Amino acid sequence: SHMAVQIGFLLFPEVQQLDLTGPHDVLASLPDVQVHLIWKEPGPVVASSGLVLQATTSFADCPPLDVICIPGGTGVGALMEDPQALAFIRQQAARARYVTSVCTGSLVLGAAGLLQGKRATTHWAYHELLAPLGAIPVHERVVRDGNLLTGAGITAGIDFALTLAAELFDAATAQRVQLQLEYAPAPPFNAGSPDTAPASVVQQARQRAADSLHKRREITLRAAARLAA
Amino acid sequence: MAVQIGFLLFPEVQQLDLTGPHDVLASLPDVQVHLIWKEPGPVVASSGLVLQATTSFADCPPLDVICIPGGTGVGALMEDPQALAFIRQQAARARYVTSVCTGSLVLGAAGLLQGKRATTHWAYHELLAPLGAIPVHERVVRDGNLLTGAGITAGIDFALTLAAELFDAATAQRVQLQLEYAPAPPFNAGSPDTAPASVVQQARQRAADSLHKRREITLRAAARLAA
């Protein structure tokens, strides 16, 4: 309807698609919501896995949003230095009811200046990059600070979206959606956190990310310098 | 030599049934993932999210794994002879025949659950028995080379289970850590056993019309298998 809650996800090249599609299916289950997928122009955008998604609106045509949500992925590094994307995020955040992200999407919020003095989380492997952007880093799965909600790595988007559902509506509605999604997880292994995974697995995860971390650290410090000037 | 994994992408799919497993499995080495429909091109999910099929039935390579997601659109598939014949064609040699949520009802309509242990979404579980399955109330059920997952989000648990079977435990653990899949749901309402009674009543009330329509489709599909 024309009174629908307006929810917008930034959809960018090399996004981690589950960061977006998990929350999307949770939030699209709520009453009278309209969901936008936003990029520089409508059309196909290819996720890091090769899955093709479709942006529904441009920055210029996007209506004022009640919720803005930034997913993460390999493509965040480019977004952290994209003045057009950062300007759009800041404009929408001025009036959004909730300003949100999943995984390394919080680094984009940081580059936009929206984490200064705020508690936030991100993917476990990139958590150290929050502090240079002014955030108070919190090692929890879903972190709230006022109208800022941030989720941790990839699959945390589902827990994040159920938390957001309860704030937009109420606990009963969020529970109904949880039941419809049969979200009673039973992972076959206990390796979802660096604290519980086998040490051998964590060490490989850290080394496989080392080059990306060093590159993102330099981008992060450039973005921080632009906030300081 | 790459492992060929195919998902059936159909109109009115529940997209998370597909996109959850897709991001898990596409993270593995030496795999190629296909999104299959009658023709390549856009296919709109039940939420309005637009996905893109990458291959037609005819161009799909022989699959190591076939996976049927669920959603509103399964009712049509259960009486679509082309889709059912394609599924049987690929199941004949696939190493694994699989589904998530109400995708197992499509496997049932194709005749592939006869005498097998299987699960589905909690609200439609009663429809497995008329399709010949032995219904099991577990989140991921394996019977030989058949793996079925329960409702929607069970696809993530299903996909990690499958990853370990295709490769090994260490490979599945690496992917689990990259996905930071250590869930901490904000409520305990993911199962009819644990949700408040008021929430269960509302969820059942909302599913009632779909369940009735699917009771009727299921009995026609079963009668075809019998005749």
Numbering used by the authors:
A (entry chain B): -1 to 227
B (entry chain A): 1 to 227
Q: Paper's wording?
A:
Engineered mutations at residue 150 (e.g., G150A, G150T) also favor shifted conformations of the helix to varying degrees. The refined WT and G150A ICH models are also highly similar (∼0.05–0.07 Å Cα RMSD). In addition, the six WT and G150A datasets show ∼2σ difference (mFo − DFc) electron density features around the mobile helix that indicate a minor population (<10% occupancy) of the shifted helix conformation. The near-identical WT and G150A ICH dimeric protein structures (Cα RMSD ∼ 0.06 Å) provide an opportunity to evaluate the cross correlation coefficient (CCCross) of their diffuse scattering maps. The CCCross for WT-1, for example, can be calculated as the average CC of CC(WT-1, G150A-1), CC(WT-1, G150A-2), and CC(WT-1, G150A-3). We find that the CCCross is ≥0.83 for every WT and G150A dataset, and each data pair within the set of replicate WT and G150A datasets also has CC ≥ 0.8, as shown in orange-colored cells in Table S5. The high cross correlation between WT and G150A diffuse datasets provides additional evidence that protein-derived diffuse scattering is the dominant feature in the processed diffuse anisotropic maps and is consistent with the minor differences in the crystal structures refined against the Bragg data. Despite the Refmac5 and PHENIX models having comparable model statistics and agreement with the Bragg data, the PHENIX models have different distributions of ADP anisotropy. In general, the CCLLM values are higher and σ values are lower for the Refmac5 anisotropic ADP models compared to those refined in PHENIX. By using LLM models that incorporate different anisotropic ADP models for the same structural model, we found that diffuse scattering data can discriminate between more and less plausible representations of anisotropic atomic motion, even when these models have similar Rfree/Rwork and CCBragg values and thus cannot be distinguished easily based on Bragg data alone.
Here, we address each of these questions in a study of diffuse scattering from crystalline isocyanide hydratase (ICH). We selected the ICH system because it diffracts x-rays to atomic resolution at ambient temperature, has clearly visible diffuse features in ambient temperature x-ray diffraction datasets, and displays large concerted motion of an α-helix that is modulated by the chemical state of the active site nucleophile. Upon formation of the catalytic thioimidate intermediate, this helix becomes more mobile and permits water to enter the active site and complete the reaction.
